[PDB]
Design a protein around this ligand. Structure first.
Ligand SMILES: *C[C@@](*)(O)[C@H](CCCNC(N)=[NH2+])NC(=O)[C@@H]1CCCN1C(=O)[C@H](N)Cc1ccccc1
Lengths: 257, 11, 28
């Protein structure tokens, strides 16, 4: 996260860290949608060009974390995957369309003051909350700067970072990338003339772009950190996966009934 | 960096 | 209907976080 802030403790209890077994390292962010299901970005697990294609054994999921590197014995919970599901029509060849993925835990985690699920939007909430001008929040342990002087500091934060960005008009979004944006995407970030900044960045993928409803007081996950061109560049915006449009696929995979 | 987690998880 | 979106240390304790208002105001 660029131009963000340290998060407060338990300020985003649905935030999940995607940890790599060997070598140990941070792959991406994710969100907890239920005691046993995790939602992330597909490109975190599968991206041929960068020669990336992980499997259930290669990873670990870490829930209830604040710090990026510490092993939080008393608050975090480490789980193993049972099965991973990637959208059949996820396009990793040209635009990252449908960059979404679900992960099944081996055993349900126990909710706590540091571990709690986020909500998924319904037609009405989506309808009324996803409007240009409205602000959403982004979180992650990703890079703090697009680029930086090697060895002089540490590109990654100590604790979870948070940033609040506004949604941008499709027309504005479309006129900013030579990439082919689709209906399963959306953008956010300030405009050059807005006087503020911020953006997600490498390592932030899979993180949730959430929103709060003043009527029912609950948090809703409207998007997923997906792609971008640089980090925090003027006249450039971050792209997110449209969770609402992909909701039937989620529903189909989950099968609660 | 990372502090170590129980080896039980790391194979 | 499963409890969700209500933070145990915030919503559930009538406490709000530091930048939350920035979100809400964007609505009006
Ligand atoms: C995997 C994620 O951590 C990362 C998120 C980057 C977010 N950046 C901003 N400004 N919000 N995603 C990526 O790095 C993806 C995966 C592969 C390529 N990529 C990009 O974002 C490229 N920088 C741009 C791009 C390449 C190919 C297709 C679409 C976009």
């Amino acid at each position: 996260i660029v131009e963000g802030s340290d998060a407060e403790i338990g300020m985003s209890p649905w935030q999940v860290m995607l940890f790599r077994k060997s070598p140990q390292e941070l792959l991406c962010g994710a969100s907890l949608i239920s005691d046993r299901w995790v939602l992330t970005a597909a490109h975190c697990l599968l991206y041929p060009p960068w020669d990336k294609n992980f499997t259930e054994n290669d990873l670990l999921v870490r829930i209830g974390k604040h710090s990026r590197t510490r092993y939080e014995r008393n608050i975090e919970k480490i789980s193993m995957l049972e099965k991973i599901y990637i959208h059949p029509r996820y396009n990793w060849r040209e635009n990252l369309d449908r960059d979404i993925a679900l992960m099944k835990l081996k055993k349900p985690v126990a909710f706590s003051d540091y571990i709690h699920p986020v909500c998924l939007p319904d037609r009405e909430t989506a309808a009324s909350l996803l409007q240009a001008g409205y602000k959403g929040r982004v979180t992650g342990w990703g890079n703090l700067k697009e680029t930086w002087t090697a060895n002089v500091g540490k590109g990654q934060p100590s604790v979870l970072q948070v940033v609040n960005l506004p949604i941008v008009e499709r027309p504005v979004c479309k006129d900013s990338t030579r990439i082919r944006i689709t209906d399963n995407m959306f953008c956010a970030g300030y405009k050059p003339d807005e006087g503020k900044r911020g953006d997600a960045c490498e390592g932030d993928s899979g993180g949730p772009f959430v929103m709060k409803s003043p009527f029912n007081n609950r948090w809703y996950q409207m998007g997923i950190v997906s792609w971008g061109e640089g980090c925090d560049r003027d006249g450039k915006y971050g792209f997110y996966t449209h969770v609402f449009r992909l909701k039937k696929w989620i529903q189909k995979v989950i099968d609660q009934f | 960096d990372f502090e170590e987690i129980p080896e039980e998880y790391l194979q | 209907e499963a409890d969700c979106g209500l933070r145990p240390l915030f919503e559930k304790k009538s406490l709000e976080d530091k930048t939350e208002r920035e979100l809400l105001e964007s609505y009006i």
